[PDB]
């Protein structure tokens, strides 16, 4: 814990919190008002360090059910900083404030929400005591590359309305730079282990073209760490020792897994899932698995609790498939990596897939229609997708991907077997 | 199986204590609210009772014709050095089990009310009653020879003396009843494990406490302790509450040291109050299983007397064969009935709000327990009224419209596991 | 394994699962249509030249698209330390030392010996005297110890094809009369092949005389050739001793074998009872039995059968259950000739207690299951009380259907109880 002396009420409420219509103290944004909750770096001539403001109505100042504004604005400024470490430094004010109850935050680009609640509104203090920690924690875990940190609380329609511009593009961008940068254009794949704590033997090679299966941990954030912080959990490794570029087989990766993982798994082909696959630590979005029987790939997610064609659900995959053991046929990777040029590249793409939940497919659409059609396979690709009320078990799908002529059927089947 | 060596012409086998009842074909009936019947096992002074007093006060079974009810009431009083009034629920749950899974009359709901319809062939043997207490005499003295000291049966038949038994069970009922509402978890430092369940399940250990009642339904925190009492070397021991780890997700240096010696060191810190984090593992004999629903947001409470399709999409005995047998499946809890009405039902995954699919019996049989912790918890006595059942629909998309319509509170609660995104 | 002659084509181990049709058919050698068969005899070296491909008939090179080519292919073997036991073997080493090369479609073996060659071979110059030769070769590569003069004959004349395929018969027949005859009683040792050990270290198919190998091809007179041929080799002789149950075939004997080459993770072994102790699977298993408390029986599912299952889940989620060297209690994989052993989980019930199976099942066994019911006097009319996926499929659908036929493992002893 962080043991400080808030009013707040202690808590983990800031992660997903729907806020009731009938208690919120402010519903910012929502297609009616700006919203932002931003981490950036300013010059040095127009900052003041240490300073703490709560602009417009305090949290008792104003009754409950009420619509303003709500954002905290961080700003800071050091010799070092670049423009690149905002969204590894506004990470953490998921682990400063989040020890708290009633608010919603997230996503600090140039267009979505942020939200608060009452019940943490007449505890006795006020937001200062908030910014004040922010601006210690900001001070304390980051002493190297910031010198001067200024943090405000805004709460007024009109200086907010600026920060409208401040929720949605700048890190979807970033990733999008992750998106539009080529898997060997750039020739330093950085590594990833903080999810070591479940399964120590996970080394998650993460790639411009293959974000981890965390899903929040991206190439050029692994690489904004390692600047921030040389010892941290994500290091660097060079390619070298080229082995095959079918499967994508290095040795620096071999030898770092091999010396990292505790020697459990020596070698890693990113391209593919039946030779040497990557492990996971539990912190999947997705889960991929074979299907010889409809000779193709099933991707379910953490949000189905359904029946699935292969026989078994995610949570009774999440046991085999985790724990950091290198499964050939299944593994756990994250749902933008399903967009990705080099996804499983050697094991048919995007093409092998066959089921998925429906609800993933909704999501997921506009990017898998744009990735079917970059390949070829046509813009209705989507459709010729099984879905769960198409058919739950194989002898159901089968009929289906014959009528649709899913092109997984028309090409050649994988791993075959002894007698 | 088990034998016996009395002499009797009656046919020992699967008909005296273990199968149900019907009236029609019903000879004679002991129990029910028609002809009550019961068994306790009391303390009463030395001078209150002979020393093997195996009785029969009434007709035995050839004495009566088909057409009259009569109880078997074996109240088998015992006096000892150092017995007390706590122990008699631990002897007295025995008294069926020499019988139990093998004969084949009834012992409806549990505890005093057994329900015995003597089959004719009985009648027409033309044995009596004497030897069915010489048998409860023998083994009783077998069993405890540290705490009994003399054991007797008295086998009224009287209607009015057969109300007056009745009377005297009820006043039993309230004092083995009342005493477990009025522990707390915070009151006693020790807590009693339970180990009876390695028979079919070795790798599971279930940790008794004052609030949380034994996955088994039948033992509770007093039941260990009388248990562990009268046994100082049973399945049960006691822990001390030392070696605090984890305040709010309930976990013990002490409880993790047992298990994990227990357990075959397969299972090394367990979590008292939440399910998505290590859960407590299950035998196979759970009254209940919950689980969580991440579509709906909350727990699905489904019980094993009933039978149907659940949201989750699969019937009780498919969830019971993957939780069962010390498998610790995150997602997944198995508990009694009564646990659902602790104060501590996992309280660090918002406890009862987090609840939004319950069948229909299990809801109305919980439905007074439900009602006063809802008020306790401030969702208002109504909260009931706001939990789907099978009737509602059996799969997610039948029941989640109704719960956004009856605005169902875990809705404005966030999401479950370990966050990392 | 790769040769030296020049050919027409490749010779690479991705060729062996090459896909021809009946129009890239040149012509076909044996299989369900055409007859055409190996062989491996005793010879000595009085009338035997080495390499010598005496191809009586006409060569692959010169015969017209969509003919018929009957094939005999005759082994002829000088070896020290050969018996005429070994005969086998080297034939099933005929599918492993022949399929390296590209356009070798080798399939089945004895009478059905399907091989297709398409015309990339007849049209480029393959000739007969290269399959000879490269035969020839293979043994002599894969057994230099053993081998000293090797012939490898190919007869593809009609007559003489027949002819040789009587001799072939005989000795079949000869084989599966041996295999019959011994008995797990008499028998004191048993074998256990680890070519199934290239995936799952710990897994070990045990093989009796009685009960046969999960991989449904290697038999115990298979394995005790190969252990005279290699006692280096996987299979070993196991004395019989420590009989611990012999209700459930327990031998501690058998115990500290297991104990020996597994890495001591599985304690005992209930050679007749699958819930207590079973063994694992490595994939070559052709069929998985499962225990149902339901209807308190076994079901047996062949690999081939998919689709919903009593138990509740796919064919699929049982492999996954017992495949992979893990070892499950209720559940096991289990050869195809286990079902007609007299040994079938005796203590267990023994074929009383299954009653699913598919129907394709009953259609193979006819001649197996209806003898042993005659056997046990079970009567041939126990095939209508065993149910099949004609009539019910699920729990419910066989739930009257069993008390209807009498079935028999509810008039018998139950297993496994509830705990209150
Ligand atoms: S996704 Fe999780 S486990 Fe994988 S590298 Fe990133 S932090 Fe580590
Ligand atoms: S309820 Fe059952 S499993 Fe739990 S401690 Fe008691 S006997 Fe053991
Ligand atoms: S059945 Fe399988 S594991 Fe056993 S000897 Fe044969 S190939 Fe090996
Ligand atoms: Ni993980
Ligand atoms: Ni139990
Ligand atoms: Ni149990
Ligand atoms: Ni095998
Ligand atoms: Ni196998």
Same mark, same amino acid.
């Given at each position: ?220 954030? *692994?690489?904004? %760490? &390692?600047?921030?912080?040389? #010892? /941290? ?11 095959? @570029? ?39 979005? *997705?889960?991929? %698995? &074979?299907?010889?029987?409809? #000779? /193709? ?11 699935? @064609? ?110």
């Amino acid at each position: 814990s962080i043991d400080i002396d808030l009013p707040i009420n202690f808590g983990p409420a800031f992660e997903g919190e729907s806020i009731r219509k009938g208690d919120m103290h402010v519903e910012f944004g929502g297609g009616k008002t700006p919203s932002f909750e931003l981490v950036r770096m300013v010059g040095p001539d127009e900052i003041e360090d240490g300073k703490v403001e709560v602009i417009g109505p305090d949290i008792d100042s104003v009754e409950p059910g009420g619509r303003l504004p709500i954002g905290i604005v961080v700003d800071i400024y050091g010799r070092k900083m670049q423009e690149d470490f905002e969204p590894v430094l506004e990470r953490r004010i998921h682990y400063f404030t989040n020890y708290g109850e009633g608010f919603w935050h997230t996503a600090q680009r140039d267009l979505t929400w942020v939200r608060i609640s009452k019940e943490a509104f007449a505890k006795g203090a006020r937001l200062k005591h908030l910014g004040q920690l922010l601006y210690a924690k900001f001070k304390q875990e980051f002493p190297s590359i910031v010198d001067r940190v200024q943090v405000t609380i805004y709460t007024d329609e009109q200086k907010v309305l600026e920060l409208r511009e401040i929720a949605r593009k700048k890190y979807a961008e970033r990733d999008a730079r992750l998106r539009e940068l080529s898997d060997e254009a750039v020739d330093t794949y950085y590594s990833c282990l903080l999810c070591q704590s479940f399964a120590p033997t996970h080394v998650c090679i993460v790639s411009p073209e293959r974000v981890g299966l965390c899903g929040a941990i991206s190439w050029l954030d *692994a690489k904004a %760490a &390692y600047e921030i912080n040389p #010892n /941290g959990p994500n290091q660097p490794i060079p390619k070298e020792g080229l082995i095959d @570029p079918v499967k994508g087989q290095w040795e620096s990766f071999n030898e770092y897994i091999y010396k990292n993982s505790q020697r459990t798994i020596e070698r890693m082909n990113l391209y593919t899932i039946m030779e040497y696959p990557m492990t996971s630590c539990g912190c999947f979005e *997705a889960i991929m %698995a &074979y299907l010889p029987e409809l #000779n /193709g790939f099933m991707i379910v997610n953490r949000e189905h609790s359904g029946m699935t @064609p292969i026989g078994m659900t995610f949570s009774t995959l999440a046991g085999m498939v985790g724990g950091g053991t290198q499964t050939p046929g299944f593994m756990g990777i994250g749902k933008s990596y399903i967009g990705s040029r080099k996804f499983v590249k050697a094991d048919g793409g995007l093409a092998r897939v066959v089921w998925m939940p429906k609800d993933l497919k909704e999501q997921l659409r506009s990017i898998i229609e744009e990735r079917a059609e970059e390949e070829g396979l046509g813009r209705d690709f989507i459709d010729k997708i099984a879905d769960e009320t198409v058919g739950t078990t194989v002898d159901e799908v089968l009929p289906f991907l014959e009528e649709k002529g899913h092109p997984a059927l028309s090409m050649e089947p994988l791993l075959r077997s002894h007698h």
